[PDB]
Design a protein around this ligand. Structure first.
Ligand SMILES: C[S@@+](CC[C@H](N)C(=O)[O-])C[C@H]1O[C@@H](n2cnc3c(N)ncnc32)[C@H](O)[C@@H]1O
Ligand code: NI
Ligand code: NI
Lengths: 163, 161
């Protein structure tokens, strides 16, 4: 049995491990990193520190980030990702190197329904060799699930790749 | 070079390690556990899974936690702690086994607040009672204990009556 504190710690530790791994594994790609969900902005802040030589675009419906974790307007894609993902695909095509999602709220069942719904909206964005890291199990057609790196906790984050 | 994600992992890992150790060290005491600040209720949810044979009272200004991490009405002490700690002292006396606080990252404000609440908290502790905090505290007669394995020095603190 795990508390909500144990789960939150395991989530953050897994994000850090999975994102650092995913950045390294995609360092030969030059397309952007997509951050789905800004929130307080901790993973965005982490990405800004660890991503070199790629842009980071942030998808968010309402910006309320800690001030030092706020994306510049040019890299903010504002609105509901159910509309903005398809709009962005027309703009940038299948060029993303890394897509990170931490879109979940407090209700795990709602989170899983949303993961199901958004999976086919995310999949077309990835370049060949691109990775997708999520704090929800995803429902992709073509992306292969990868084994987790050291430090990650099974069931907290999931990693997928466009082969 | 630590990011905000690195810092918050260290905060939460240290809080958990300190709290679990503190709960165990005070498991022989029958007086209640006081949680100062509910917030989203993750820490309260943790306390519920680990504290045995004692009540948990939560001090909060206004409840904003999901139902799954909200204490029962009877264990919620609502209002500004400058008032509610002294009011609680008249009600329950120096019987608390464990008092826990996370402050929330600005050095000077936190420190002034730690100085403000230290003398409010101190009289509540029963003999053998512990106080666990995210920030350095300023007690008259409580001794600082070593950190347990897993806690990051400077990110959490433990004191004892
Ligand atoms: C858990 S918070 C993100 C926390 C972040 N990863 C961090 O480390 O601080 C989830 C965020 O996703 C956003 N979000 C959820 N559904 C969305 C949607 N359909 N479109 C755009 N943003 C959404 C929320 O508004 C919220 O800011
Ligand atoms: Ni299908
Ligand atoms: Ni399918």
């Amino acid at each position: 049995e795990q508390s909500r504190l144990d789960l939150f710690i395991d989530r953050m530790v897994s994000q850090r491990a999975c994102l650092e791994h995913a950045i390294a594994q995609t360092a030969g790609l030059s397309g952007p990193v997509y951050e789905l969900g800004l929130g307080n902005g901790r993973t965005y802040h982490h990405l800004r520190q660890h991503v070199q030589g790629r842009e980071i675009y942030v998808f968010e419906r309402a910006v309320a980030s800690h001030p030092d974790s706020t994306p510049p307007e040019a890299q903010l894609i504002l609105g509901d990702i159910r509309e903005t993902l398809p709009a962005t695909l027309e703009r940038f095509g299948a060029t993303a190197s890394l897509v990170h999602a931490d879109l979940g709220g407090h209700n795990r069942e709602k989170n899983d329904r949303f993961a199901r719904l958004i999976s086919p909206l995310i999949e077309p964005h990835l370049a060949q060799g691109g990775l997708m890291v999520s704090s929800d199990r995803m429902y992709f057609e073509g992306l292969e699930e990868l084994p987790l790196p050291p430090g990650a906790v099974v069931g907290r984050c999931f990693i997928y790749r466009r082969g």
